[PDB]
Structure 1
């Protein structure tokens, strides 16, 4: 029932604020300022010394990323599930915007600098120039920007891009391909357009962001068709890499290693 704290703050005698005087407060704040400044300087010096030992081209260790994952584009809003209304343009506008933003480097206009490379052969580049192969947008026929303004949307047959994760100096063996299949018994037809998955070896190995300028990773586009009258919603479709032994796709701990599962639902 007594306020011993009230006198503790703003003590009229000796002018002690919270048990410590004005001079001692100044001394302790100065000491802590200098101490933390020295600590920050030591941390910065140690960080700079660590960074000097690194290489800007290739990471020191690659043992934690041995095999490529598989991812779809664009990223849906929630839980990798594509939801849109055929009669409502605003529902599928975000997918269109992301797709045109992503496919802009792939069109013929910009990749005129890139060079055509012979097909079917791994492209090893010992030289320092590190030039890139071009990926024509015509390979994703009926799922590309040239054929139609809407990437399959408003027609009931949406287009989704499947892309392999980039790894520096990874050389796939065999013929890598991506096969996509519906999981449900209704089996809505899925059509990977550039023949099979057919990831071409001429794009590998990836040589890094710093060195291999203008790299365009191989793209596989899928089109899950739906009937005009029948929405055919809640379709689960799974893509995976099954043409290469180097690229593993049977992992249990990581469900995205060499494969990807995504869901599509359509309205009207």
Structure 2
């Protein structure tokens, strides 16, 4: 048994078959698997021919847009000590990674960054989604616009003395036009003042009624000094048609933050084609847990 089924010397068999059998079977599986591979490849090439290069066929799974943030906090918590410097390093490295893409050196020349209104403005249509007029042009977004959170003056961005910043960003969607709420009698309390039609408002608050008092002065920095996103940076034409495109950003400084206590801060954007979801806690709004323990 043990020895024979391994090698017998009368029938010159190994493991059970002879030399010619292993060859017939190996050749059969090589041809079979080769045909399988060729068929799968052909059915994938017809797929490359079906879709378009400038536009995803289905855009229903990404609407309305989300709201992401830097830094990169795990479990949506930003906890760091004001004394130990090796506590907020993982945060600064991220913040820096995000802002490092808005360097002025990158935005230079006429293309593909054209100078746009220093004050919020309306939409700008650079034609259709075609290759006729080549690479489109995107508006320039300067770092300095963000006042106290730019890494140009205080590299740390605030984490050094108990005053952190949070750079909020709206998820890029192809052909998405942001629509802000109108001046009619129905509008949230907050939004009434400084209604600039051309700005999509972003406003943070406290999740619970108690935490209100423990949260200090939320100071928003942005284009034109408003707490929102200028409509002029839309719509987005996609990577293929608009490489070297920069999306607006909004800085938020949480000055006067109570020490040694977990604070739940919920930020929320407002607008017509903006809708929240009780399941996705990043659709339109976002939550952050801040605790400057020192």
TM-score w.r.t. the length of structure 2 is 0.81
Out of 14, 18, 23, the residue aligned to residue 17 of structure 1 is 14
Unaligned ranges ≥5, structure 1:
none
Contact 2:274/2:284 (8 A) holds in 1: yes
Alignment partner, residue 64 of structure 1: 61
**Do 2:13 and 2:19's aligned partners in 1 also have CA atoms closer than 8 Å?**
yes
Summarize deviations over 1:144-170 as a string: whole Å, max 9, x none: 122312111111112121111000000
Give, in angstroms, the shift of residue 5 of structure 1: 4.8
Runs (5+) with no aligned partner, structure 2: 181-198
Matched residues in 2 for 1:16 and 1:179: separation?
Answer: 80
What SS class does the counterpart of residue 219 from structure 2 fall into?
coil
Higher mean C-alpha displacement, 197-206 vs 254-263 = 254-263
- CA change 1:10–1:237 in 2 (3 A) is farther
Aligned residues: 260
Aligned with 2:202 (options 168, 171, 178): 178
User: C-alpha root-mean-square deviation of aligned residues, in Å?
Assistant: 2.0
Offset, 1:196: 4.2
- Residues 68-147 of structure 1 aligned to structure 2 (within 5 Å): 68-76=65-73, 78-113=74-109, 114-118=113-117, 119-126=120-127, 128=133, 129-147=135-153
The alpha carbon displacement at 1:213 in A equals 2.3
- Is the Cα contact below 8 Å between 1:179 and 1:196 reproduced in 2? no
State how far apart, in whole Å, the 1-side matches of 2:81 and 2:37 are: 54
Report if the CA contact (8 A) 2:215-2:256 is conserved.
no
Tell me whether 1:156 sits opposite 2:153 in the alignment.
no
Counterpart of 2:237?
A: 207
Structure richer in strand, relative to its length: 2
In the TM superposition, structure 1's runs of 4+ consecutive aligned residues that sit over 4 Å from their partners are: none
How big is the shift at 1:203? 0.4
Give the Cα–Cα distance (whole angstroms) in 2 for the partners of residues 66 and 161 of structure 1. Answer: 22
